[PDB]
Amino acid sequence: DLQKMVMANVKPVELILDGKTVALCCATGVFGTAYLVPRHLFAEKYDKVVLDGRQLDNSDFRVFEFEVKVKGQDMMSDAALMVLNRGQRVRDITMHFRDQVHIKKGTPVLGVINNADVGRLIFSGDALTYKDVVVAMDGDTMPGLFAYRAGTKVGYAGGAVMTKDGAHTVIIGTHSAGGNGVGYCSCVSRSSLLQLKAHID
């Protein structure tokens, strides 16, 4: 039910260069024209980018990078924010995130995915614990992640992951990376999301 309203915001993303599909992932709308996106992809180069079929050029959107406090230290989240100069409205789902969430073990976990490989998919998983920092093979550091047990191929990055606490269904952040039957999300705080909605509305 809520799960679907998250999907309404999730959109297939891709990165092209010289005509060939170089990369592919997801992005989740949070408000207005703001989309949560895997930062470690805008690092490596792109020519064109497709969001939901829209043939975007480089100069038509702008990216916001955030820092996170991991053990009282300041690192740059792998969850970035792609904002279109002009585009379509997504729902405000920023109201669903939180800030001081410590999720219990074994709890269910859902991963709303929408891309060009699989399509509009959801998956299930189990909550493990908080991981401080995770480093990729090329050095794409991913701080403040959250570990959950589930099957996650490539192109799931950017999808929206939601769990439970009490009677509430909280969105934690966006799926970042994984493999080995385990997955990782860039933990995103509501406070952070609101302080940017102020600056864009």
Numbering used by the authors: 7 to 207
What's the publication's text?
Cell entry in infected hosts is followed immediately by translation of a large open reading frame in the viral RNA. This yields a polyprotein precursor of over 2,000 amino acids that is processed into fourteen distinct capsid and non-structural proteins for virus replication. The majority of this processing is done by the virus-encoded 3C protease (3Cpro), which cleaves the precursor at ten distinct sites. FMDV 3Cpro may also assist infection by proteolysis of host cell proteins and has RNA-binding activity that is important for initiation of replication of the viral RNA. Crystallographic analysis of the 3Cpro from a type A FMDV (sub-type A1061) showed that, similar to other picornavirus 3C proteases, it adopts a trypsin-like fold consisting of two β-barrels that pack together to create a centrally-located Cys-His-Asp/Glu catalytic triad in the active site.
We report here the cloning and expression of 3Cpro from four distinct SAT1 and SAT2 viruses and the crystal structure of the 3Cpro from a SAT2 serotype virus (SAT2/GHA/8/91). Accordingly, for each SAT sub-type we generated expression constructs that add a thrombin-cleavable His tag to the N terminus of residues 1-208 of the 213 amino acid 3C protease; following thrombin cleavage there is a single additional Gly residue appended to the N terminus of the protease polypeptide. To ensure the solubility of the SAT-type 3C proteins, we introduced to all constructs a C142A substitution to remove a surface-exposed Cys that had been shown previously to be responsible for protein aggregation. In addition, the active site nucleophile was eliminated from all constructs by incorporation of a C163A substitution to prevent adventitious proteolysis in highly concentrated samples of purified 3Cpro. A complete dataset to 3.2 Å resolution was obtained from crystals of SAT2/G-g3Cpro(1-208). The crystals belong to space-group P32 and have a long c-axis (318.5 Å). The diffraction data were phased by molecular replacement using a search model based on the crystal structure of type A1061 FMDV 3Cpro, which is 80% identical in amino-acid sequence to SAT2/G-g3Cpro(1-208). This gave an unambiguous solution with a log likelihood gain of 1495, revealing five molecules in the asymmetric unit. Model building was done conservatively—amino acid side-chains were truncated to the Cβ atom in cases where there was no indicative electron density. The final model of SAT2/G-g3Cpro(1-208) contains residues 7–207 for all five chains and has an Rfree of 27.2% and good stereochemistry; full data collection and refinement statistics are given in Table 3. As expected, given the high level of amino acid sequence identity with A1061 3Cpro (80%), FMDV SAT2/G-g3Cpro(1-208) adopts the same trypsin-like fold, which has been described in detail elsewhere.
